[PDB]
Design an enzyme around this catalytic site. Structure first.
Site, PDB file in Angstrom:
ATOM      1  N   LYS A  36      12.930  -5.564   2.708  1.00 31.92           N
ATOM      2  CA  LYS A  36      12.085  -5.759   1.534  1.00 31.92           C
ATOM      3  C   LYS A  36      12.934  -6.055   0.302  1.00 31.92           C
ATOM      4  O   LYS A  36      13.661  -5.190  -0.186  1.00 31.92           O
ATOM      5  CB  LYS A  36      11.207  -4.529   1.292  1.00 31.92           C
ATOM      6  CG  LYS A  36      10.299  -4.641   0.075  1.00 31.92           C
ATOM      7  CD  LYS A  36       9.336  -3.467  -0.010  1.00 31.92           C
ATOM      8  CE  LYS A  36       8.431  -3.581  -1.228  1.00 31.92           C
ATOM      9  NZ  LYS A  36       7.394  -2.510  -1.258  1.00 31.92           N
ATOM     10  N   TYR A  86      10.451  -2.103  11.195  1.00 31.79           N
ATOM     11  CA  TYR A  86       9.707  -3.328  11.475  1.00 31.79           C
ATOM     12  C   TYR A  86       8.427  -3.045  12.262  1.00 31.79           C
ATOM     13  O   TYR A  86       8.465  -2.424  13.326  1.00 31.79           O
ATOM     14  CB  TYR A  86      10.600  -4.317  12.233  1.00 31.79           C
ATOM     15  CG  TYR A  86       9.868  -5.461  12.901  1.00 31.79           C
ATOM     16  CD1 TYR A  86       9.056  -6.319  12.169  1.00 31.79           C
ATOM     17  CD2 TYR A  86      10.007  -5.695  14.263  1.00 31.79           C
ATOM     18  CE1 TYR A  86       8.390  -7.367  12.779  1.00 31.79           C
ATOM     19  CE2 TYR A  86       9.347  -6.741  14.881  1.00 31.79           C
ATOM     20  CZ  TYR A  86       8.542  -7.574  14.134  1.00 31.79           C
ATOM     21  OH  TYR A  86       7.883  -8.616  14.748  1.00 31.79           O
ATOM     22  N   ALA A  87       7.298  -3.500  11.723  1.00 28.75           N
ATOM     23  CA  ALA A  87       6.003  -3.359  12.386  1.00 28.75           C
ATOM     24  C   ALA A  87       5.570  -4.691  12.993  1.00 28.75           C
ATOM     25  O   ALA A  87       5.135  -5.593  12.278  1.00 28.75           O
ATOM     26  CB  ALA A  87       4.956  -2.852  11.408  1.00 28.75           C
ATOM     27  N   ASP A 130      -2.652   4.257  -3.179  1.00 32.55           N
ATOM     28  CA  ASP A 130      -2.747   2.810  -2.993  1.00 32.55           C
ATOM     29  C   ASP A 130      -3.078   2.449  -1.546  1.00 32.55           C
ATOM     30  O   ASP A 130      -2.498   1.526  -0.972  1.00 32.55           O
ATOM     31  CB  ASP A 130      -1.445   2.126  -3.424  1.00 32.55           C
ATOM     32  CG  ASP A 130      -1.612   0.629  -3.643  1.00 32.55           C
ATOM     33  OD1 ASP A 130      -2.760   0.179  -3.846  1.00 32.55           O
ATOM     34  OD2 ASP A 130      -0.596  -0.096  -3.610  1.00 32.55           O
ATOM     35  N   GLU A 134      -3.928  -4.136   3.225  1.00 35.27           N
ATOM     36  CA  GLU A 134      -2.671  -4.877   3.180  1.00 35.27           C
ATOM     37  C   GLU A 134      -1.455  -3.950   3.210  1.00 35.27           C
ATOM     38  O   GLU A 134      -0.329  -4.402   3.419  1.00 35.27           O
ATOM     39  CB  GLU A 134      -2.620  -5.770   1.938  1.00 35.27           C
ATOM     40  CG  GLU A 134      -2.465  -5.015   0.630  1.00 35.27           C
ATOM     41  CD  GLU A 134      -2.655  -5.909  -0.581  1.00 35.27           C
ATOM     42  OE1 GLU A 134      -1.824  -5.836  -1.511  1.00 35.27           O
ATOM     43  OE2 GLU A 134      -3.636  -6.681  -0.604  1.00 35.27           O
TER      44      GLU A 134
HETATM   45  N1  LIG Z   1       7.915  -3.143   7.793  1.00 38.05           N
HETATM   46  C1  LIG Z   1       7.143  -4.256   7.774  1.00 38.05           C
HETATM   47  N2  LIG Z   1       6.857  -4.932   8.909  1.00 38.05           N
HETATM   48  C2  LIG Z   1       6.090  -6.039   8.897  1.00 38.05           C
HETATM   49  N3  LIG Z   1       5.548  -6.564   7.782  1.00 38.05           N
HETATM   50  C3  LIG Z   1       5.752  -5.988   6.572  1.00 38.05           C
HETATM   51  C4  LIG Z   1       6.581  -4.774   6.504  1.00 38.05           C
HETATM   52  N4  LIG Z   1       6.625  -4.408   5.211  1.00 38.05           N
HETATM   53  C5  LIG Z   1       5.891  -5.309   4.511  1.00 38.05           C
HETATM   54  N5  LIG Z   1       5.370  -6.251   5.320  1.00 38.05           N
HETATM   55  C6  LIG Z   1       4.517  -7.377   4.869  1.00 38.05           C
HETATM   56  O1  LIG Z   1       4.828  -7.664   3.503  1.00 38.05           O
HETATM   57  C7  LIG Z   1       3.693  -7.428   2.665  1.00 38.05           C
HETATM   58  C8  LIG Z   1       4.102  -6.736   1.373  1.00 38.05           C
HETATM   59  O2  LIG Z   1       4.811  -5.531   1.650  1.00 38.05           O
HETATM   60  P1  LIG Z   1       4.747  -4.342   0.568  1.00 38.05           P
HETATM   61  O3  LIG Z   1       5.885  -3.382   0.823  1.00 38.05           O
HETATM   62  O4  LIG Z   1       3.320  -3.849   0.524  1.00 38.05           O
HETATM   63  O5  LIG Z   1       5.027  -5.188  -0.774  1.00 38.05           O
HETATM   64  P2  LIG Z   1       4.472  -4.728  -2.214  1.00 38.05           P
HETATM   65  O6  LIG Z   1       4.967  -3.309  -2.366  1.00 38.05           O
HETATM   66  O7  LIG Z   1       5.114  -5.704  -3.174  1.00 38.05           O
HETATM   67  O8  LIG Z   1       2.972  -4.861  -2.089  1.00 38.05           O
HETATM   68  C9  LIG Z   1       2.731  -6.578   3.475  1.00 38.05           C
HETATM   69  O9  LIG Z   1       1.371  -6.897   3.163  1.00 38.05           O
HETATM   70  C10 LIG Z   1       3.067  -6.930   4.907  1.00 38.05           C
HETATM   71  O10 LIG Z   1       2.255  -8.035   5.310  1.00 38.05           O
HETATM   72 MG   LIG Z   2       4.599  -1.905  -3.938  1.00 33.65          MG
HETATM   73 MG   LIG Z   3       1.744  -3.637  -0.736  1.00 38.34          MG
END
Ligand SMILES: Nc1ncnc2c1ncn2[C@@H]1O[C@H](COP(=O)(O)OP(=O)(O)O)[C@@H](O)[C@H]1O
Ligand SMILES: [Mg+2]
Ligand SMILES: [Mg+2]
Ligand SMILES: Oc1c(F)cc(F)cc1-c1cc[nH]n1
Ligand SMILES: [Cl-]
Ligand SMILES: [Cl-]
Ligand SMILES: [Cl-]
Length: 265
Positions: A36, A86-87, A130, A134
């Site tokens: 991230k 990782y998901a 939150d 998503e």
């Molecule tokens: N560990 C993960 N595995 C797969 N997809 C992810 C993972 N983390 C985030 N994502 C994808 O990235 C998007 C944004 O991640 P997030 O951490 O929620 O960002 P933000 O905090 O800016 O909203 C999620 O909606 C998801 O689709």
């Molecule tokens: Mg955030």
């Molecule tokens: Mg988010």
């Protein structure tokens, strides 16, 4: 310790307000993870440094099967990197767009897994604040995992930061700027259960101003296909008065949940 040169970057997994998430592999161990990436300039401009620190501090110490793990972090002169679990099966949001609606079995199972994760969180007086599709990821076995702890705090609390996007999942006390506690996650749980079965949140509306009005007055109605069991649980969760909302144990023990869920407490 860690640096960018330790990883090979793959395809974009998704994007957020600040976070750009990529698939990545650590070179020496071949370990697959999610990276991230947040830009420092955008973080300072928005003044949400404290939110990022809270996300790192809280999520890194939590250990639960239904909560996304945070392994570590590092930064260069321009970006901050969060090393995430990782998901592989993506978001509930994507799955919902694909199927339009979830059946009662799928919904109750998701709610059970959510309640378990939230029960673990609230035991440490941690509020997520939150919870929305998503921010809910799916493991290799299709199990639900809560992610994005950027808005998470300790109870009780007020709100210091400006509300950015949608109001759809927030309780009256949060949008009205009043003091709040753990009960806000259970309001969101009710909103989620509705959206899973119906296909859209109960207070969804065309404008910010009106969405505000429907939430503060708790104005929602059920389509005919929603069964009496689902209606009972949802109506109990979406109470204006926080103290009237049920305990998480009551949710896990609800007759509609126990009859349709495929996972235990
Ligand atoms: N560990 C993960 N595995 C797969 N997809 C992810 C993972 N983390 C985030 N994502 C994808 O990235 C998007 C944004 O991640 P997030 O951490 O929620 O960002 P933000 O905090 O800016 O909203 C999620 O909606 C998801 O689709
Ligand atoms: Mg955030
Ligand atoms: Mg988010
Ligand atoms: O550099 C950081 C770090 F290493 C860990 C963390 F949680 C936050 C930061 C941060 C926030 C704003 N600038 N930098
Ligand atoms: Cl950013
Ligand atoms: Cl406060
Ligand atoms: Cl805040």
């Amino acid at each position: 310790q860690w640096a960018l040169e330790d990883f090979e970057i793959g395809r974009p997994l998704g994007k957020g307000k600040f976070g750009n998430v990529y698939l990545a592999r650590e070179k020496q161990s071949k370990f697959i993870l999610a990276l991230k990436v947040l830009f420092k300039a955008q973080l300072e401009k928005a003044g949400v440094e404290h939110q990022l620190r809270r996300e790192v501090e809280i999520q890194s110490h939590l250990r639960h099967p239904n909560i996304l793990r945070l392994y570590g972090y590092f930064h260069d002169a321009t970006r901050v990197y969060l090393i995430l679990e990782y998901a592989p099966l993506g978001t509930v949001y994507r799955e919902l767009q694909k199927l339009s609606k979830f059946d009662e079995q799928r919904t109750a199972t998701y709610i059970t897994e959510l309640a378990n994760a939230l029960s673990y969180c609230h035991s440490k007086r941690v509020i997520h604040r939150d919870i929305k599709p998503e921010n809910l990821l799916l493991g290799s076995a299709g199990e639900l995992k809560i992610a994005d702890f950027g808005w998470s705090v300790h109870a009780p609390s007020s709100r210091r930061t400006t509300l950015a996007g949608t109001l759809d999942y927030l309780p009256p006390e949060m949008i009205e700027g009043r003091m709040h506690d753990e009960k806000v996650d259970l309001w969101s749980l009710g909103v989620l259960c509705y959206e899973f079965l119906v296909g859209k949140p109960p207070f969804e509306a065309n404008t910010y101003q009106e969405t505000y009005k429907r939430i503060s007055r708790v104005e929602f109605t059920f389509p005919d296909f929603v069964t009496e069991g689902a209606r009972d649980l949802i109506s109990r969760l979406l109470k204006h008065n926080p103290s009237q909302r049920p305990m998480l144990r009551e949710v896990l023990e609800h007759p509609w949940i126990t009859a349709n869920s495929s996972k235990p407490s």
